[PDB]
UniProtKB/Swiss-Prot annotation, chain A:
The lineage of its organism: Eukaryota, Metazoa, Chordata, Craniata, Vertebrata. It comes from Homo sapiens. Keywords: Cytoplasm, Cytoskeleton, Nucleus, Phosphoprotein, Repeat, Ubl conjugation pathway, WD repeat. It is found in: Cytoplasm; Cytoplasm, Cytoskeleton, Microtubule organizing center, Centrosome; Nucleus. This is DDB1- and CUL4-associated factor 12. InterPro entries: Beta-prop_DCAF12 (IPR056151), DCAF12 (IPR051191), WD40/YVTN_repeat-like_dom_sf (IPR015943), WD40_repeat_CS (IPR019775), WD40_repeat_dom_sf (IPR036322), WD40_rpt (IPR001680). Coiled coil: none annotated. One of its GO terms (biological process) is protein ubiquitination. The gene is DCAF12. The keyword Cell inner membrane does not apply. The keyword Phosphoprotein applies.
UniProtKB/Swiss-Prot annotation, chain B:
Residues 392-708 are annotated as: WD repeat beta-propeller B. Pathway: Protein modification; protein ubiquitination. Phosphorylated by ABL1. Ubiquitinated by CUL4A. Subsequently degraded by ubiquitin-dependent proteolysis. This is DNA damage-binding protein 1. It comes from Homo sapiens. InterPro entries: Beta-prop_RSE1/DDB1/CPSF1_1st, Cleavage/polyA-sp_fac_asu_C, RSE1/DDB1/CFT1/CPSF1, WD40/YVTN_repeat-like_dom_sf, WD40_repeat_dom_sf. The modification N6-acetyllysine is found at residue 1067. Residues 771-1140 are annotated as: Interaction with CDT1 and CUL4A. It is linked to White-Kernohan syndrome: An autosomal dominant disorder characterized by global developmental delay, variably impaired intellectual development, hypotonia, and characteristic facial features. Some patients may have genitourinary and skeletal abnormalities.
Length: 390, 1140
């Protein structure tokens, strides 16, 4: 017996209220995921003179926070383009990673000290706690394994595990009631564990991406020498396995698709699809064709993967069709802004535009609004880009 | 900023849940019926169901349960809404007043968690120790029934079984014990826990059974002495009790899914079961007495009782009667029999209850072409599908019709002195009189002795002393009932002809030029007591008796030809008591004295169709409280009639109207008749409580419906109507519809039963060559429940299915419009369709078809095959605009009477809805809300003016005016988005501003321009502009309209005040209820006014009105805002009632 899957059944049944419920959920949102990329138009934001928006997420359907290579943190109201800056959390450089706990009660970011983790309350972005000392080097990644516990990776290859217990929250609240100036709660790593070091370059131990599989309570992790490390995260951080990525350079982004049990991983050219339990041959990869520029962020909306590239193009890949959506359909980031200091003067003397690399992008809670941000691809350049697409 | 009002014209009707218990008392068996936002409480009597109380909640209802905490004399009622507002309710009554008191309440929504994959579930423990809720997957929410838990605080027990299909609490267990079906990778299982309110966790239950039937749901907890539980699937029924297991799998139930059940016997010996069709079964649990004396289950056994309404829910009642709650058709009361009838049926229908839901389409029409507007809706589904001809005004049930033209009057007579009922009807004509004898239902023309046949009758009727009276131009004639003999005759002293007359049981008054004569009716004698001469010729006169008087009127009411005045004269003196100037230039044509609600009124109607009415003081003849309503354009004749023993007045005109009093004010309701010149009451053996109606060419005899405002002439199709439109040129309705036929061993399909398309006076099947290009040969699998669609052409006067065109196999006919196109004069039926197949999410195939109905024949004028489903079509500048999946397409009407491509618009996910005005096009997307286009005649293309970038799951759209666009979405919210002409940049201009947001609570199926209330042309003080009617899946009909700014800035303030003053059942805040609500966001109501709430302003006492009124700013038309009064708001709300 075949499945009742046509949207016209759903529409007529809905006209009849004949159980037009979740049985059609995957059909409704899946259809949208294929259609939406062709309907999007760019709306750039006037951010001013900021360096590069390196991280961003939807706090709410209308609100996106942006974390910068230059340690300022702020909100873009995507509707009005209004800016509002947020406190930058210090210890007891830039905001290269940002994360939300699954309850959407806590925000996690890199701190003032690039080595230290920062926590804020959702939705107010009240500060919660001080920066730690678990990493001896910069915090390169974050992932929420419960609503009290988050794991953070680092450029030294260590992985700090943290718990914001109720005591941390109540201490922050009590302190904020006694003192008019915000005074933070104190935190320390519940565990500090290093990655297995493989046959690749021993100075390049950098752990640049993390993603939490809520179903198996597994934590995925990716290094820039090209290795994935898998950890159990039920109540504590525990190694399960480690394995090489099929593209072994510039793996700066990782996302986990709970509807497909698979992690999507970036690189200098390809998006790779991993179930970490499977052998290396069961790891299929699609090339962005924006070759030389790197994939710079990645995300899932039903069976469609959104790929932000170093050439500033956003590509959309269909798992089921095993191809990009349509002559691939791609948005491309506008000029944004660019500073003309001595560094540009020395090395980029005649370039007035950069194909603004998509350092961060995310879908709103409906998926109809795709926030996008970035800047120039090379390392010496200073020049933000941001724009909503809708 | 934007200014809009939304109101319910008709309440929801479709039953979404029902239960029986002992809510109003222990001894009342109640049936409780939930309809989507409406709770209804019925008492089970031997005679039938009696409605006792109805409540509208500020909340769609999702769970309903009755339970009895220990020590309570009667049940408590648990209700959970779709917004997760929970409450515990108790029926209270004080004298006639009834209130539903909330003992406990609280929102139980969790801030994060996916709402459960199989509706919302709530159940109550037999000993009422706790309530269990399944709101979210993986979480079982427990509410202790501690009396101190008055706030419905709850805790979640983490449930490792994520997907829960059904739940119950078991009987006879010392610990409250949950029993539930859940689904896992292993299939479905039944499992139990002893729920510890102390440990707030699942201790192990008394038993478990893995691997029940994969389709299993519908858990029945089985009471003492049996204990245990029954599990009901698609194919089998299984009983479990500790170690004991029993199962049966009747082939008779395998034909359909059981979807509800009810406990017949308190000890669980018998259970009703109801399938998708409304086949109703009895499930027997046969007892075995064991050797220790205990009672156990011996075997299960299922009997088919017969057929009933499609069951959403079932209820065994009392005396062998059963109620069937129907969502898709009329709900039913049926009696079960011990012995079957000749058909083998044990089920006999006892009563039936009307249901409009789901209203899947509608259109506004003038079949009498008067311009009032009537609404014909697609209603019900499957074997219950039915057209509902809805209309502001009272219907007439025609029992007989006679082709007697030129009738100038109507009166009943009782020729037989032994009969209390009428046996004769009298018709007047110019220069002659005719009489119709009544013999049961049979009507035959006869000669009534004592009456004059060669003269026009101006009045006749039964009179005192067992006599009949006739009044003619030459004389007043008194005739005995037996032997129909003339006993007395009176003539005018100057032999001048009587021109009008009125008479009661003891008095006669006649108009002769300017003179009036008053006679008394004595046994076999007419006595002239008095006479008078009026200043002007008499245009009309009346002496209808009032109050408890024994047919003796102290008053005579008259109207005159020259001064256009109404006058009250004292009888017998003819002394002038009161003179009232009606004004205008047209004479009064009828005057009448009557009683409503034991209050006395004078009515006088002008030849221009204007009606004046007054309070009438009998003792003084004085008139008060003068009011004016225009009923027609032609001369109006006023007559009294009786209905349900009440006294009412009928205004015979080109726009026939019934006049009755409510709350001491006269209410005017149209009558659904083409025209009436004269009428009279008739209470005969064949036509009891009936009216006789005469127009220019015919006499109609029938019974008036209840004096409701909205009538519904139901037409059963026995198949689901889908869309409807009207063709004035052919006086026909086009109706899309769809019956079910199972693809059985016929190889094709076999109908469940005959329906309109099979029953039609003629039929056809789509003969098109477009869709020939591929089939697989082996497609047609056995048992498939195919929906076969048809276009029904329906005569507007008889609602005969004149024609029925069957669409292609699997071709859902999706949209239907009737309009003119191009410069071609014809009106055409135009249908948009889709081929629907199980697997394809979006339709890739469809067509647009143009038909004309002429000379009895539906004919196909044109076709165009399309790349998508044609979800909607509208007329646009004589070109046709049609939306097809993700695109909107504009077809020019060729002079060759066929559509041709002018242009296209894209930039959509799926353009489900289309509406147009001028050069502007409003489009509704499946998720991207609304966008506005402009047509460019100089370019041959569309320019997208602006769009809403907010997400909305559109259910319907409409254009209220040039700048304001109305939308509805699947989360039951409305919104208005508006074009900002003050925008300064292109980016601002491209963005439609959200300027109204509103949670309606009903899923809206259709918006349509039109009004069912006749327009008072020349009266432009109406607070509202435009008129968009809409229908819903629950049978609710509403209306949306624009406002001025000062109307809306008055009215949303009025709404927020009412939100706080009126207390909802379950204590849900109205602002929260109406707050725009989706999974993703909540926003306060703006841009809309809640017309239901605004009309609830008339459902509250003045003290509450005063609370709302105080300090509200009202623009009274002077342009100066002032503090409103309650009477001002009442007038405004009354105006707002009259728009629908």
């Amino acid at each position: 017996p075949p499945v009742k899957r046509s949207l016209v059944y759903y529409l007529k049944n809905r006209e009849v209220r004949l159980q037009n419920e979740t049985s059609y959920s995957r059909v409704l949102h899946g259809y949208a995921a294929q259609q939406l990329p062709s309907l999007l138009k760019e709306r750039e934001f006037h951010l001013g003179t900021l360096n590069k928006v390196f991280a961003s997420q939807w706090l709410n359907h209308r609100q996106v926070v942006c974390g910068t290579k230059c340690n300022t943190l702020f909100v873009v109201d995507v509707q009005t383009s209004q800016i509002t800056k947020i406190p930058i959390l210090k210890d007891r450089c830039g905001i290269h990673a940002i994360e939300l706990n699954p309850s959407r009660t806590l925000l996690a970011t890199g701190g003032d000290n690039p080595n230290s983790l920062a926590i804020y309350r959702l939705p107010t972005l009240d500060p919660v706690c001080v920066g730690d000392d678990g990493h001896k080097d910069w915090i390169f990644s974050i992932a929420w394994i419960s609503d009290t516990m988050a794991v953070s990776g680092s450029r030294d290859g260590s992985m700090g595990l943290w718990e914001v217990t109720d005591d941390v929250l109540t201490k922050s609240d009590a302190r904020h009631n006694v003192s008019r100036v915000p005074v933070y709660a104190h935190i320390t790593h519940k565990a500090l564990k290093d990655i297995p070091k493989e046959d690749t370059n021993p100075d390049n131990c950098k752990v640049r991406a993390l993603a939490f599989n809520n179903k198996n309570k597994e934590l995925g992790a990716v290094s820039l020498d090209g290795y994935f490390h898998l950890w159990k995260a039920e109540n504590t951080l525990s190694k399960l396995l480690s394995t090489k990525l099929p593209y072994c350079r510039e793996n700066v982004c990782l996302a986990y698709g709970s509807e497909w049990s698979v992690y999507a991983v970036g690189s200098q050219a390809h998006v790779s699809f991993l179930d970490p339990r499977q052998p290396s041959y069961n790891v299929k990869s699609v090339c962005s064709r924006e070759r030389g520029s790197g994939i710079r962020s990645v995300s899932f909306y039903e069976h469609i993967i959104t790929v932000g590239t170093g050439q500033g193009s956003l590509l959309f890949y269909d798992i089921r069709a095993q191809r990009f959506l349509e002559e691939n359909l791609k948005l491309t980031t506008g000029k944004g802004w660019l500073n003309h200091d001595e560094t540009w003067r020395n090395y980029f003397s005649d370039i007035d535009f950069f194909p603004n690399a998509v350092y961060t992008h995310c879908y709103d809670s409906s998926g109809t609004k795709l926030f996008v941000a970035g800047g120039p691809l090379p390392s010496g350049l200073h020049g933000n880009y941001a724009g909503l697409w809708s | 900023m934007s200014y809009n009002y939304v109101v319910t014209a008709q309440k929801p009707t479709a039953v979404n849940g029902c239960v029986t218990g002992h809510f109003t008392s222990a001894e009342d068996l109640n049936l409780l019926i939930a309809k989507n936002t409406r709770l209804e409480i019925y008492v089970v009597t031997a005679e039938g169901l009696r409605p006792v109380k109805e409540v509208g909640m500020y909340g769609k209802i999702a769970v309903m349960e009755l339970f009895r905490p220990k020590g309570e004399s009667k049940d408590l009622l648990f209700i959970l809404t779709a917004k997760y507002n929970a409450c515990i309710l108790e029926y209270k009554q004080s004298g006639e007043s009834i209130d539903i008191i909330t003992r406990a309440h609280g929102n139980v929504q969790d801030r994060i968690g996916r709402p459960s994959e199989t509706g919302i579930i709530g159940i109550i423990d037999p000993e009422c120790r706790m309530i269990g809720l399944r709101l979210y997957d993986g979480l079982f929410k427990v509410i202790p029934l501690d009396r101190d838990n008055k706030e419905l605080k709850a805790f979640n027990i983490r449930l490792e079984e994520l997907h829960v299909i059904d739940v119950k609490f078991l009987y006879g267990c010392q610990a409250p014990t949950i029993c539930f079906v859940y689904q896992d990778p292993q299939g479905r299982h039944v499992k139990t826990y002893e729920v510890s309110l102390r440990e707030k966790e699942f201790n192990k239950g008394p038993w478990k059974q893995e691997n029940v039937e994969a389709e299993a749901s519908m858990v029945i907890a089985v009471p003492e002495p049996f204990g245990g539980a029954i599990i009901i699937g698609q194919e089998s029924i299984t009983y479990h009790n500790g170690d004991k297991y029993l199962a049966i799998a009747p082939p008779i139930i395998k034909q359909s899914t059981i979807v509800c059940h009810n406990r017949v016997d308190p000890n669980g010996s018998r259970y009703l079961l109801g399938d998708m069709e409304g086949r109703l079964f009895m499930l027997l649990l046969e007892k075995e007495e064991q050797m220790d004396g205990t009672v156990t289950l011996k075997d299960l056994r299922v009997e088919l009782l017969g057929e009933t309404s499609i069951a959403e829910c079932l209820t065994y009642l009392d005396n062998g009667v059963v109620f069937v709650g129907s969502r898709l058709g009329d709900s039913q009361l049926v009696k079960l029999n011990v012995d079957s009838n000749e058909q083998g049926s044990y089920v006999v229908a006892m009563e039936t209850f009307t249901n409009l839901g789901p209203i899947v389409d509608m259109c506004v029409v003038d079949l009498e072409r008067q311009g009032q507007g009537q609404l014909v809706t697609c209603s019900g589904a499957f074997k219950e599908g039915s057209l509902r001809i809805i209309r502001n005004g009272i219907g007439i049930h025609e029992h007989a019709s006679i082709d007697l033209p030129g009738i100038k009057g109507l009166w009943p007579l009782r020729s037989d002195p032994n009969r209390e009922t009428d046996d004769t009807l009298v018709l007047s004509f110019v220069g002659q009189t005719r009489v119709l004898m009544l013999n049961g239902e049979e009507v035959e023309e006869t000669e009534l002795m004592g009456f004059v046949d060669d003269q026009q009758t101006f009045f006749c009727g039964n009179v005192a002393h067992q006599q009949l009276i006739q009044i003619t131009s030459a004389s007043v004639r008194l005739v005995s009932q037996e032997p129909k003999a003339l006993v007395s005759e009176w003539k005018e002293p100057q032999a001048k002809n009587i021109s009008v007359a009125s008479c009661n049981s003891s008095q006669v008054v006649v108009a002769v030029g300017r003179a009036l004569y008053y006679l008394q009716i004595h046994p076999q004698e007419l006595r002239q007591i008095s006479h008078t001469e009026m200043e002007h010729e008499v245009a009309c006169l009346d002496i209808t008796p009032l109050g408890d008087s024994n047919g003796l009127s102290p008053l005579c009411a008259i109207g005159l030809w020259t001064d256009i005045s109404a006058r009250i004269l004292k009888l017998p003196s003819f002394e002038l008591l009161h003179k009232e100037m009606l004004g205008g230039e047209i004479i009064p044509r009828s005057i009448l004295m009557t009683t409503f609600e034991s209050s006395h009124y004078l009515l006088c109607a002008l030849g221009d169709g204007a009606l004046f009415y007054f309070g009438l003081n009998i003792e003084t003849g004085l008139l008060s409280d003068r009011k004016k309503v225009t009923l027609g354009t032609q001369p109006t004749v006023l007559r009294t009639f009786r209905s349900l023993s009440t006294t009412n007045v009928f205004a015979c005109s080109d726009r026939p109207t019934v006049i009755y009093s409510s709350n001491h004010k006269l209410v005017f309701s149209n009558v659904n008749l083409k025209e009436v010149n004269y009428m009279c009451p008739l209470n005969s053996d064949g036509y009891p409580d009936s009216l006789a109606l005469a127009n220019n060419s015919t006499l109609t005899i029938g019974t008036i419906d209840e004096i409701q405002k909205l009538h519904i002439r139901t037409v059963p199709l026995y198949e689901s109507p889908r869309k409807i439109c009207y063709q004035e040129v052919s006086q026909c309705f086009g109706v899309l519809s769809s019956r079910i036929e199972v693809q059985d061993t016929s190889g094709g399909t076999t109908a469940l039963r005959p329906s309109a398309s099979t029953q039609a006076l003629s039929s056809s099947v789509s003969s098109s060559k477009l869709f020939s290009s591929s089939t697989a040969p082996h497609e047609t699998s056995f048992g498939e429940e195919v929906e076969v669609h048809n276009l029904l052409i329906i005569d507007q006067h008889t609602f005969e299915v004149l024609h029925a065109h069957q669409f292609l196999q699997n071709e859902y006919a999706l949209s239907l419009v009737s309009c003119k196109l191009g410069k071609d004069p014809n009106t055409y039926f135009i249908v948009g369709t889709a081929m629907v197949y199980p697997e394809e999410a979006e339709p890739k195939q469809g067509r647009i078809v143009v038909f004309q109905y002429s000379d009895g024949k539906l004919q196909t004028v044109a076709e165009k095959e399309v790349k998508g489903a044609v979800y909607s079509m509208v007329e646009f500048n004589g070109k046709l605009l049609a939306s097809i999946n993700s695109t909107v397409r504009l077809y020019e009407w060729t002079t060759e009477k066929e559509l041709r491509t002018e242009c296209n618009h894209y930039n959509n996910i799926m353009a489900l809805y289309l509406k147009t005005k001028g050069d502007f096009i409003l489009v509704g997307d499946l998720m991207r809300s609304v966008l506005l286009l402009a047509y460019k005649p100089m370019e041959g293309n569309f320019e997208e003016i602006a769009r809403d970038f907010n997400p909305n799951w559109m259910s319907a759209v409409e254009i209220l005016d040039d700048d304001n666009f109305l939308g509805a979405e699947n989360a039951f919210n409305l919104f208005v988005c508006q074009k900002d002409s003050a925008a300064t940049t292109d980016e601002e201009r491209q963005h439609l501003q959200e300027v109204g947001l509103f949670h309606l609570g009903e899923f809206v199926n259709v918006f349509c321009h039109g009004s069912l209330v006749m327009q008072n042309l020349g009266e432009t003080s109406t607070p509202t502009q435009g008129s968009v009617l809409f229908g819903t899946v629950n049978g609710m009909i509403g209306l949306v309209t624009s406002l001025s700014e000062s109307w809306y800035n008055l009215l949303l303030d009025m709404q927020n005040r009412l939100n706080k003053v009126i207390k909802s059942v379950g204590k849900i805040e109205h602002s929260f209820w109406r707050s725009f609500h989706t999974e993703r966001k909540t926003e306060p109501a703006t841009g809309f006014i809640d017309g239901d709430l605004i009309e609830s302003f008339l459902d509250i006492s003045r003290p509450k009105m005063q609370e709302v009124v105080a300090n509200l700013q009202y623009d009274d038309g002077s342009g100066m805002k002032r503090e409103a009064t309650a009477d001002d708001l009442i007038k405004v709300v009354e105006e707002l009632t009259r728009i629908h």
